[PDB]
Symmetry: D2
C-alpha cells in the first residue's frame, strides 16, 4: 500500500485532521481508494471514558467504537465507515504487546520499545490499511496516517521510531511524510516567523523522518521571504513549502492544496495512476445571506457539522446559539427558529416544554427523547436497525419512505414498554419491539425525538434527515419538502 | 523516606546492581534499614517467561514472584526478602494506568506519560519503599532504586522524568542520584577515556537529574588526570568522582566505596544518623589455596553464588566446571568431586547414574530429583513448607535438626504418590503428604535430590545447606561436620 | 554582582529586550544600579556593516560602537550610556580566543568551546558588568544579560553552556534566569496553546538552566487553565508564570511586571536591599487626542522613538507617515505638518525643496544636512563636541542656551570649508572650525539640518531638542516655547 | 569529486586516522588519486603552539604548516605531500568568516553558523579536494575527510551540519560516511557491548547523516550475535558492519578492510572505475626475530615510525627505549645499540658525550646537532634545500650520492658562521652558505647531526636515510650497505 504520514509541529490545533482529510478527498477525487488511520499517543483505550471538554465529542463508529472526533472528519470528507482499530492508541498497542508476552509469543525474549512496540505499530498499520473501509471489498491504495500530538512529545516517540523504520521496511515510492507546522504572525509588525517550523523540522529530522511537504498554517498567506527562509533552513524546495491560511470554511482547504499543487507532488513521489463539490460548497458558504437561528441546549462537533450540512443544503447560514441548559438563555430561546436538545449523560426540560407549548421546531437526540417523553408525561452502542411503526411519520418521509433505518446508538437507558400504553406517538422501535427509539408529536410542525445519534451519519453530500427536517421546519419549507 | 537512585551510562553490564547492593550493605552496616527497588524498563510482566540466556536466571521470591537476578543481589547483600512489587517494570506500570483508565479513575481526562505514568512510578516507589522487607515491622529509612538500562534508552525515559519530578516533590536531603559509567581503557596506549562518561552525564543532565556521585568502572584504577577531566567536564567535585576497578570479588566492592568515602558523602547529603565481614570474606577469597571441582551439569547465578558461599565457608576455591548435559564433558565429570544437576524445563541422567554407581557426591535440584527418581527406577511457586519424614537424614542434620524447612519452589511436576510404594528414600514431603520433595540415597556419602531451589535462600553469612553438604562431601568433611 | 539572564523561546520578536529593559528600570526605581549586556549570537563584529532592514537600525554609542537597536532600548529605559563591549557577539569572543591562542596564552593546550569559549563569555560578563555605565563611578549591583536568539539555535549553545556553569561558579542568590516564550492563540477557537513554552523550557532545562520566571507573551491575557498547564508541565509555581499581553505602549510593560509581582520575586530570590513616570506616560499615551502628522522621508527606530517622546511631551499623538524617497507620497507630503529627512548612505531633495518653498517645518539629519546645503545651492563616529557660532539660533534655545552640545556622529562626508563663503546660515561647527555641523535657514519657522544623530540621546524624560523643535513648529507652539 | 567522511563515536583514540588512511591506500591501490583533509574542531590555528603531550607531535608540512600527527598518517600511507589548508580547524574557518564580514563580503546580512560557517566548510572542502597533492597535476578523484572528535561534541556540530547539507548539495554517488565506534568488551564475561555504537549512530542520525559503514573497533573480533544487534539497532545491513580488532601492526588494517569487502561496497556506492606491500610488511613484522635496541633520549611519533620503517627494511624488531634526558636511564643507555637525540625547544649532552667517547651510533636531530656541536666544543620552517660540502660523507651515500637534499626544517637557532673556523666536520649547509645544517664526526662508525627533521619524509617504501644509517650502524651493516 502507499502510506502518507501526517505529523504535527508546534501546536496540535493547527488542523492536521483537516489537512489529512483534505489530501484524502483529493486522492479520492483522483479515483484512489483511501484508508485512514489515526494515531492518538494517549494511553486511553477508546474515548468512551472521555469528557466532551477534553478531546471534543465522542464520535461513535458502526462497530460500537467510541473515538475522538478526527475519525468523524475522515468519515465526513472521504465517505468511509471506519472500524475501531483504525484508531491506534498507545494503550491498545502496549496492552497488545503485554498480552502477547503473557501468551509466551515473544519466545522468552525481553520485550522493549524498539523492536516490539515499533513492530506492533507497523503490523497494525499494515493490516488495518488493507481493510475495506469503503463499501467496496476492493482493497485500498493509499492509507493516510495522522500522527496526533506534536513531534517532540514523549508519548509520540514510539510511533515516529516505527515510521522511521517503515520508510526503510517499505520503499520511498510507498511512503511520504507531511509536516504541518504553525507560522506565528506578530501583532506589532505583521512579521511571520519561521523559527518554530525550523526547530520542529529539526526535531522530526533528528527522529529519522523528513518533511516531504511542509504545510505552514498561518493567519495571513505567507510572504515569499518567509517561504525562502523555510525552504533554506528546513532543506526542502519552494514547491514543498505549502501555505494554508485562515479561510471561510473547511470546504476551501482541499482547494488550497490543489492550488499549491499537491497532486503533482504525490503523482511524482508516490507513483500514482492519476473536486468541483468542494469549490461549489465553499462558494455557496461565502454567498449565504439568509439566517436560521437554532438553539443548541467541539463538545457537539458532529451536531454542528450536521446542522451546517443541512443549512448549506437550503442556502441558509446557521446562527448556532449554544445555551447551557442550567440557565439571556431565554432571550436566545425566544429567537430560536428551532430547539436542538442533544445527548449527554434536567434543565433541558425548560426548552422542551417551551418548544411543545409555543410550537417552535424541536429535535431531541438520545436524552432529548427520554426527557421529551418525561415532559409529555408531565450499552446499546454502534449501528442498530430501527423499524418504523407506520408510513405516516415525518422522519420516514425525510429518510425516503424506507421501512427501517440503520443509525448509530449510544445509550444505556430506554423507554419502559409497560408505560407506553399510558400514551406524542412512538413512531420507531427496535426489531425486538421492546424499545421505542423514535417519537413524533403530531400537533406540531416538527417535534421529533430519536434515541440514536444521526449526526455521525451526516456528510455534506447527504445531510442527516432529522437535522434537515429541523432546518426545513425552522424555515417553513418542511411543508414544501414533503410535497 | 530517603531515596538513592542509581542510573547507568554507556553499557548495562558495569555492575550497577553490585554498586546499589554495596551502598545498601554500607548503610545497613551504619544501622539503617534499607529497602531496594529495581526498575527494569522491559515491558515483560515478571521474568517467568524469560530464557535464562536473555537476562540471566529467573530468581524466585517468597510470594512466587519470578524476577531477574539483581533482586537476588539485593537479597544476598542486604539479607532482605523482597516482594514482587519491589520489581517495577514498564509492563506493570502501563497495565496499571490502562486498568485505572478502564475503571474511570482518571475522571474522563486524557491519559498520557507525563503526568500519569510518571505519577504511577512515584506512587509505586513511595509505597513499596515503606514496605518492611527486613523481618522488622519497623518501616525502612532508605530505598535504593536501581534504574536498569542505560540513560538514553527510550524505554527508560518515563522513569528519569518521574525521578526528575521526585527530586522536587521531595527534598534534596531525601533524594540523591548515583551515575555509574564506563571509563574505557585503550590497549594501544593504556589511555583511559572520559568522553563516554561526559556524554552520558550530559544526557542525564538533559533529563533534569545530575550525578551526586559519578562511579567510574574501569579495568585499572583511574589516574588523577582522568579524574580531573571528569570533575571538570561533568561539573562535580573530585570527591564525587569514585573509581571502582576490577578486583578479586564482589566482597571487595563495598570496601572500595568506604575507601572512596561514600558514607561521608551520604552523611552530609542525606542527613543520616550515622563492615568487617566484607573485608574478612574478601581477604579469605584472595587467600584460598585448596580446590573443590564441582561439575555443574549467569543462567545458574544463584547456584554458583551458593557454591561459592559454601566453598568460602570451608576455605576452598571453587573450580566450577559447567557441562552441557547433551555431551571432554566426561573428562570434567571424572575430576568431579561432586555432581550438581540443577533445574531447567534428559542427558543429565548420564551424570546421575555415574554419581550413583561411582559414589561421587550428588545434589539434584528440581528436575535433578525427578530424574534421580527416574534413574533409580531404571505452578508450585514461591515459599512452601517441606516437612521431614525422619530425623535420620543428612539434610535434617545440615539444616540444624529442624522438623521442617521453608524453601522456594518453582515446579509444575511432582512424584506420583501411587508409585512411591515401588521404592532411595523419600525423606521430605509437602504438609499434604502427597508430593515427595526431598530424596536421599543411603548407600552413598551424599546423594540428595530436592524439589525446591535452596539457592535463593543462600547468603554469605549462612550458606545453603544442600549446597554446603555437597562441598563437605566432595572434601570428605561431611563425616566430620555431622560429628 | 547579581545577574539576570533573559533567554528567548519560540521566536525572537516577542519583546525580550523590552522585558529586560523593563526589569532593569523596575530595579532602577528600587534604587539599584543596573548594568546591561546584550549577547548577539551573530558572528558579525559590530553592526557597522548591517543593513537597517536586517536587524533594524544601527544604534551608535558614545565610544563609536555601532550596535543593534536593543542597546538603545537599554539606554532609553535605564538612562545609561553603554560601551561597545556591553555588546557581546560570537565574532568578538571567537576572535579573542583565537588571538589569545596566537599569543601563546593557552600554554600549548588545545583550545575548544568548553572550556575556553565558555570562560571567555564568563570573563567578559564578569568584567563589563563591573563597568560604571551610569555617570556614577560607583560599581553596579545588577547586570541584566539579554541572550538574543531563541534557545535551541546552534549559535546560542556556547552562551547557555557558559551560563549553566556561571550558576555554579556564582551562587543562586546572584543568578536568576527569565525565559520569555510565545503562547500562540488560535483564531478558530480563542484557545491559547502552551506546547511551545513546554518544549522550549524542556530545551533550556536540557541545557542545564531552568526558568526562574516564565514570561508568556500573548495577544490576549492568558486564562488560568493555560497558566495551570504551564506551571505543571514547565515545573514552576503559578507566581513564576507571568503574562504580558498586547498593550498600548512599552510604557505599560514595566507596570504589568509590578502587577505580576516581579519585585517580590527578585527581593526573595536575589536577596536585594529593596515607578510613577511609567504609569503617567502610559496613561498619557492612551489619552492622546490631538494629532501631529510628520513625513519621514525598525530601520528608523530611534528616530520614531524620539518623535514619540517629543509628541508625548506636547500631548499629541504622532501620525508618522513613512515615505520612500524615490516616490500618494506627495499626498502624504501635503498633509505633512513637518518633514523629517533622516540619514542613510537623492530623491529626498524633492521634500527639502518642498519644505523650503512652502515653509513646512524641516529636520534634516546627517545626509539631510548635506542635501539641504546642496538644495539651497540649487569615519567621524561616536560622541563629538559641536560648538555654536552664535546664540541667535533656534537649536541653541532648544538645548537650553549652552554654547556647545555633545552628540553622536556617524558620517564620512562633511561640508567643504572653501565653499561656505558662497553662502541658509551655518550655525554649529566642530571645535577645529573646519566642518559645519548644524545649519539653520532663517526665513522659515523651523528648517534645521544637523550632521549628528540626536535620536540616540533621546529618552522619555528628556526629548531630543531637534526632534522636539520639529513637533513644536508643526503645532505652531515653537513661538510659544522660545518665549 | 567523490567524498568519504569518517566520523567518530564513543572515544577519539579508536584509530579513525588509521581507518581513513587505510581506505585511502586501498583506493590508491585501485588506481584512484586520493586527497585527504582533516577536520580538527579545535580553535587553534595551526599546531605550532601545541605541546607534544596534548595532541601528540607537531608534524611539519613542506609549506611550513605545523599540524597534528594525523596528516603524517595520510602522508605515510598514501605517499602524498599535503598543504596547510588540508588541515581545517574551527579557528581557521571562524577567522575566515569574521574577516569576510569585516571586508563587507556578506553584504550587510547577519553572519550565523548556518549558513555562513557551514558554507565556509563546504567551500574549503570542495576547493582543497581539487588541489593536486600527489606530484601529478591531474586533479584528485576521492577526498577522504576525517572529522576529528566524537560526534556529540559541541565543537563538531558546525561540521556535521555542513556535511548533512553536502550530501544534498552533491549526490549519493559522490558522498559516503564511515562511522568508527568502540565496541567495549567486559573483563568479567567477555561480553561485547553494542550500546555505545547504537547511541552514537542515533546521535549521527539525529544530525542528519547516517552510517554507510559502521566500523567496530574492538579488542577481540566481534561475534555474530553482536553484529546482528548492531545491524538491527543501527539500521544497516550485516555487510555494512565491519570489525577491526587488535592486530600486530597498522600494516594489517588495510588487509582487514579488504577481507571485510570495503572495495565492493565503495565500487557499488561511489560508482568507482575499479595491496601486496601491506600484506608483505604485515607478514614481515610478525616474523621479526632479531632486535635492535635504540635509546630515544606519541610526542615522537614520526621518529618512532621512521625507526620502524628502517628496522623492517633490515628485518629487525625495534626495541625503542625512551629515556627522559634529565635522568635505569644509563642502564638503557648501556644496552643502546644507537642513541637517538631528537628535537625539542640540556641533560641530552650526557648521551652525546657517551655516544662520542664509547663509539656507540648517534643520530642528533635539530637540537641534537646544536648540542653535539656544543659537546664537541667542550622560524626556518618547512622544506628547504641543504647542499652537501663534499661527496665523502655517510649521509650523501645514504641519500644516493645526490649533491643536495630537500628536507623539512623547524628551527629558530643555527650554528654561528664565525665560530665554525674553531673546528667534527660540517658536511651540509644552506644554499646561502651561512648555516651549517649537517655535521658528521669522522672518528666514529655513525655520529651525524642534522638541523632538519627527516622523519616527516619517512614512508614504509622509502625509509628516512639518517634513521636507516643509525640502524645499519647499530647492526654493523652500514659498512656493508655503503659497499
Ligand atoms: C487546516 C485547516 O485550516 C483552516 C483554515 N481556515 C479555516 C478552517 C476551518 C476549520 C473548521 C471549520 C468548521 O468546522 N466549519 C464548519 C463545517 C461545516 S461541514 C465541516 N466539515 S465536515 O463536515 O467534516 C466536511 C466538509 C469537510 N465543517 C461550519 C462547522 N471551518 C473552517 N481551517
Ligand atoms: C514585551 C513587549 O510587550 C509588548 C506588548 N504590547 C505592546 C508592546 C509594544 C512594543 C513596542 C512599542 C513601541 O515601540 N512604541 C513606541 C515608543 C515610544 S517610547 C518607546 N520606547 S523607548 O523610547 O525605548 C522607552 C519608553 C520605553 N516606544 C511608539 C514607538 N509599543 C508597544 N510590547
Ligand atoms: N447518548 C446519550 O445522549 C446518553 C443518554 C442517556 N444518558 C443514556 O445512557 O441513555
Ligand atoms: N524448576 C525446575 O527445575 C523445573 C523442573 C520441572 N520442569 C517442573 O516443572 O517441575
Ligand atoms: N549617517 C548618515 O546619515 C550618513 C550620511 C553620509 N552617507 C555620510 O557618510 O556622511
Ligand atoms: N625543532 C627543534 O628541535 C628545535 C631546536 C631549537 N629549539 C631551535 O629552535 O632551533
Ligand atoms: Mg492540549
Ligand atoms: Mg543487552
Ligand atoms: Mg529572524
Ligand atoms: Mg582527549
Amino acid at each position: 500500500m502507499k502510506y502518507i504520514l501526517v505529523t504535527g509541529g508546534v501546536i496540535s490545533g493547527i488542523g492536521k485532521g483537516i489537512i489529512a482529510s483534505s489530501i484524502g478527498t483529493i486522492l479520492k477525487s483522483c479515483g484512489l481508494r483511501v484508508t485512514a488511520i489515526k494515531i492518538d499517543p494517549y494511553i486511553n483505550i477508546d474515548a468512551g471514558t472521555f469528557s466532551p471538554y477534553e478531546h471534543g465529542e465522542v464520535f461513535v463508529l458502526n462497530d460500537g467504537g467510541e473515538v475522538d472526533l478526527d475519525l468523524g472528519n475522515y468519515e465526513r470528507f472521504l465517505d468511509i465507515n471506519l472500524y475501531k482499530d483504525n484508531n491506534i492508541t498507545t494503550g491498545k498497542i502496549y496492552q497488545h504487546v503485554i498480552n502477547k508476552e503473557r501468551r509466551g509469543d515473544y519466545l522468552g525474549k525481553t520485550v522493549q520499545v524498539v523492536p516490539h512496540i515499533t513492530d506492533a505499530v507497523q503490523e497494525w498499520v499494515m493490516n488495518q490499511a488493507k481493510v475495506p473501509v469503503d463499501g467496496n471489498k476492493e482493497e485500498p491504495q493509499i492509507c493516510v496516517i495522522e500522527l496526533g500530538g506534536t513531534i517532540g512529545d514523549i508519548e509520540g516517540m514510539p510511533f515516529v521510531e516505527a515510521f522511521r523504520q517503515f520508510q526503510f521496511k517499505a520503499k520511498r515510492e510507498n511512503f511520504c511524510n507531511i509536516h504541518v507546522s504553525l507560522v506565528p504572525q506578530l501583532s506589532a509588525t505583521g512579521e511571520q516567523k519561521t523559527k518554530p517550523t525550523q526547530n520542529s523540522v529539526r526535531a522530526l529530522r533528528g527522529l529519522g523522518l523528513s518533511p516531504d511537504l511542509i504545510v505552514c498554517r498561518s493567519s495571513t498567506p505567507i510572504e515569499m521571504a518567509v517561504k525562502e527562509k523555510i525552504s533554506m533552513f528546513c532543506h526542502v524546495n519552494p514547491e514543498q513549502v505549502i501555505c494554508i491560511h485562515d479561510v471561510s470554511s473547511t470546504y476551501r482547504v482541499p482547494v488550497l492544496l490543489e492550488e499549491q499543487s499537491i497532486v503533482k507532488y504525490f503523482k511524482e513521489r508516490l507513483h500514482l495512476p492519476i473536486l468541483f463539490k468542494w469549490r461549489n460548497m465553499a462558494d455557496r458558504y461565502e454567498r449565504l445571506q439568509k439566517i436560521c437561528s437554532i438553539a443548541l441546549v467541539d463538545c457537539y462537533a458532529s451536531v454542528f457539522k450536521a446542522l451546517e450540512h443541512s443549512a448549506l443544503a437550503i442556502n441558509h447560514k446557521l446562527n448556532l446559539m449554544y445555551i447551557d441548559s442550567i440557565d439571556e438563555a431565554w432571550q436566545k430561546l425566544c429567537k430560536a427558529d428551532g430547539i436542538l436538545v442533544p445527548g449527554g449523560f434536567l434543565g433541558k426540560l425548560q426548552a422542551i416544554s417551551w418548544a411543545r407549548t409555543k410550537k417552535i421546531p424541536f429535535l431531541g437526540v438520545c436524552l432529548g427523547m427520554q426527557l421529551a417523553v418525561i415532559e409529555f408525561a408531565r450499552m446499546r452502542l454502534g449501528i442498530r436497525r430501527t423499524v418504523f411503526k407506520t408510513e405516516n411519520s415525518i422522519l420516514r418521509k425525510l429518510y425516503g419512505d424506507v421501512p427501517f433505518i440503520e443509525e448509530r446508538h449510544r445509550h444505556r437507558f430506554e423507554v419502559n414498554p409497560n408505560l407506553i400504553k399510558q400514551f406524542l406517538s412512538f413512531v420507531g422501535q427496535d426489531v425486538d419491539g421492546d424499545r421505542m427509539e423514535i417519537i413524533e408529536l403530531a400537533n406540531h410542525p416538527y417535534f421529533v425525538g430519536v434515541q440514536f445519534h444521526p449526526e455521525f451519519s451526516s456528510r455534506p453530500m447527504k445531510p442527516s434527515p432529522p437535522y434537515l427536517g429541523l432546518l426545513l421546519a425552522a424555515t417553513g419549507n418542511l411543508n414544501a419538502y414533503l410535497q
